[PDB]
Structure 1
Amino acid sequence: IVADHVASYGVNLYQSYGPSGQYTHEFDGDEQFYVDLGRKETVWSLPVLRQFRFDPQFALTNIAVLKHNLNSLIKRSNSTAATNEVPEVTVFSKSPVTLGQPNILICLVDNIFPPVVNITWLSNGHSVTEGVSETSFLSKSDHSFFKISYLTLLPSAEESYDCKVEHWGLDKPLLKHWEPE
């Protein structure tokens, strides 16, 4: 469909593995908010949107409808499971690299299905957790997902990084390297 703008009010996800769910709204491909289903609270992704209120119970009730519908379709499909796809991983920086100026590494994990993935960061072969964050699963029109992880850093001549991606569509974890040059 062709449109000046496209929104999802919202993207609802529920899956048997876990199990787990996700509730978000999207506008022109970006995440407006998610509902933390465990804490039952709306978490706005854009500071200008904090002026609004969204009842988290709407999300919890909707996910329960998805959970019920899924159980029905598992039976009717004769337990037709999801097919694992091969995700595509790319690492790049938010801004041009200048040594000694703060930056952010971005790891895009695209063509994700099913939406179950572990994205971590490595430096000199050891895991890095400080300064790491990630988006929710963001929707795609072919009904796969993408997800983006971030690592804040101070670029330095001696220090390189890997984005590490575990997904059932991969024989072994995928490492995408980034060098400051």
Structure 2
Amino acid sequence: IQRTPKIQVYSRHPAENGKSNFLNCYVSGFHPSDIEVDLLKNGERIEKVEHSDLSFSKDWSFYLLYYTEFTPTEKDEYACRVNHVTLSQPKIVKWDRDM
């Protein structure tokens, strides 16, 4: 079976412009486990991004956390881009400090 990924983009700590933080992209509820997740800064791919060890939920659906340090500002737009077999095209979820 195949399951489309759920995606939440958020910061580890409450956001404050100019203050160092961590940008997270939690992808979950998907199957198979092969997936492409990238964090973006102003539409550009961020390098050195890390992620947790693949694990899964009671219903066997996989979940992973991708993260990197970052500094929110008034201008820069951050986002997560996810590609999976279940998606007709890469899904881009923009970071919103209010969520």
* 1:136 equivalent in alignment to 2:50: no
TM-score, structure 2 normalization: 0.90
Q: Is the 8 A contact 2:2 2:86 kept in 1?
A: yes
Q: Determine which of 23, 28, 39 is the counterpart of 1:110.
A: 28
> What is the match of residue 85 of structure 2?
168
CA shift digits 1:88-112 (9 cap, x unpaired)? 0111110100111111011010111
Shift of 1:151: 2.0
Gaps of 5+ in 1: 1-82
Q: Is the 8 A contact 1:160 1:179 kept in 2?
A: no
CA shift digits 1:110-165 (9 cap, x unpaired)? 111011001111122111114x2101111211111100100211111111111010
Q: Rg bigger for which structure?
A: 1
> What is the match of residue 7 of structure 2?
89
Runs of 4+ that moved beyond 6 A: none
AA partner of residue 58 (structure 2) = S
Cα distance between partner residues in 1 of 2:11 and 2:40: 15
> What is the match of residue 71 of structure 2?
154
Report percent identity of matched pairs.
Answer: 27
Higher helix share: 1
Q: Determine which of 98, 111, 128 is the counterpart of 2:16.
A: 98
Gaps of 5+ in 2: none
Query: What RMSD over aligned residues (CA atoms) do the two structures have, in Å?
Result: 1.4
AA partner of residue 171 (structure 1) = S
Q: Which has the higher contact order (CA 8 A, sep 6+)?
A: 2
AA partner of residue 121 (structure 1) = L
